[PDB]
């Protein structure tokens, strides 16, 4: 994974990310720059996974990251009920406009599968069990193909 620096040192960067994730959980949709959203979505999914686990150690690890009591309660009750059957990808990021003043490309980022979302998301599907992969050579034998007849 490419981890961005965002023009900040470590403490400022991590405090800004924790504030952004807390505000995303609180307001259910925020508009920010695209480069910040591309870093937010990973941690916003990690907190939902901690809430889906819901043990005491997960509660402690999530309280060591997010800010607020409304945030921790919402993650550990409402999101654990909502995203129970979904595997991953609880957030949607969409580019919207260009900011006057510094020409920054802006984007909505929101939690999915709720009322008043930007797009109708796919239904939650359980993952099929792990399949034993083929060898690269056995796959290369099956990957051989000819040009389609059109000319």
């Amino acid at each position: 994974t490419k981890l961005r620096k965002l023009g900040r040192h470590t403490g400022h960067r991590m405090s800004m990310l924790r504030t952004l994730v807390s505000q995303l959980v609180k307001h259910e949709r925020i508009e920010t720059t695209i480069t910040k959203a591309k870093e937010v979505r990973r941690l916003a999914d990690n907190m939902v996974q901690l809430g889906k686990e819901g043990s005491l150690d997960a509660a402690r690890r999530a309280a060591g990251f997010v800010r607020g009591d409304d945030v921790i309660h919402k993650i550990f009750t409402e999101f654990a009920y909502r995203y129970k059957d979904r595997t991953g990808g609880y957030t949607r990021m969409l580019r919207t406009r260009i900011r006057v003043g510094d020409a920054a490309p802006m984007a909505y980022i929101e939690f999915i599968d709720r009322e008043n979302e930007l797009r109708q998301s796919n239904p939650p599907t359980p993952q099929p069990p792990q399949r034993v992969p083929l060898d690269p050579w056995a796959r290369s034998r099956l990957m051989r193909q000819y040009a389609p007849p059109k000319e």
Binding site: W137, R144, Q145, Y146, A147, P149, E151
Partner: protein
């Protein structure tokens, strides 16, 4: 994956679609028809080959990395010229900088050839070849293997024009072939 001109080129030649193309000069008695499939048994274990590939990229780099310059001292009064090149010519005769002067610029990601690299092992079931040492390029990229020009192999042992594998062959019965080292121990006659 292919554009329309390459799709048409493959469809006209009557071959399956490929990823990378290369052209090798041969003589008249070493030609092969269109559609011949070439394997690892084209090479014999124990011989030397030449590998050509695109080397690893370093980007824009300075003189101290590019050309192993010495630079300036880190102390003793030196000011803002720690890793610079120094002089770039003489004064007034010539009054110009000579061509080929070593200066910073883009480094690497060019084509290079490694000579006399040794074939150790051959696995024809999986079409793998174990070659001793280093090979220019990144992992996941393409290299091109010819015979060595410096240590030329034996004429009577190489398959010509290539190894013609029988069509009645199965990959179940193929064992990997190791290059013979002989019998006289190197570490004992010392």
């Amino acid at each position: 994956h292919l554009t329309m001109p390459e799709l048409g080129h493959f469809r006209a030649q009557g071959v399956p679609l490929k990823r990378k193309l290369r052209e090798f000069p041969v003589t008249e008695d070493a030609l092969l028809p269109v559609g011949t499939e070439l394997g690892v048994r084209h090479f014999v274990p124990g011989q030397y080959v030449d590998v050509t590939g695109i080397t690893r990229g370093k980007g824009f780099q300075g003189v101290m990395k590019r050309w192993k310059f010495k630079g300036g001292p880190a102390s003793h009064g030196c000011s803002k010229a720690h890793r610079k090149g120094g002089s770039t010519g003489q004064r007034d005769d010539p009054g110009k900088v000579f061509k080929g002067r070593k200066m910073p610029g883009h480094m690497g990601a060019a084509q290079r050839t490694v000579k006399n690299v040794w074939v150790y092992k051959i696995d024809p079931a999986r079409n793998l070849i174990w070659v001793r040492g280093q090979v220019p390029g990144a992992e996941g990229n393409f290299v091109f293997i010819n015979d060595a020009c410096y240590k030329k192999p034996d004429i009577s042992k190489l398959p010509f024009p290539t190894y013609l594998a029988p069509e009645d062959e199965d990959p179940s019965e193929l064992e990997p072939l190791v290059a013979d080292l002989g019998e006289v121990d190197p570490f004992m006659l010392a």
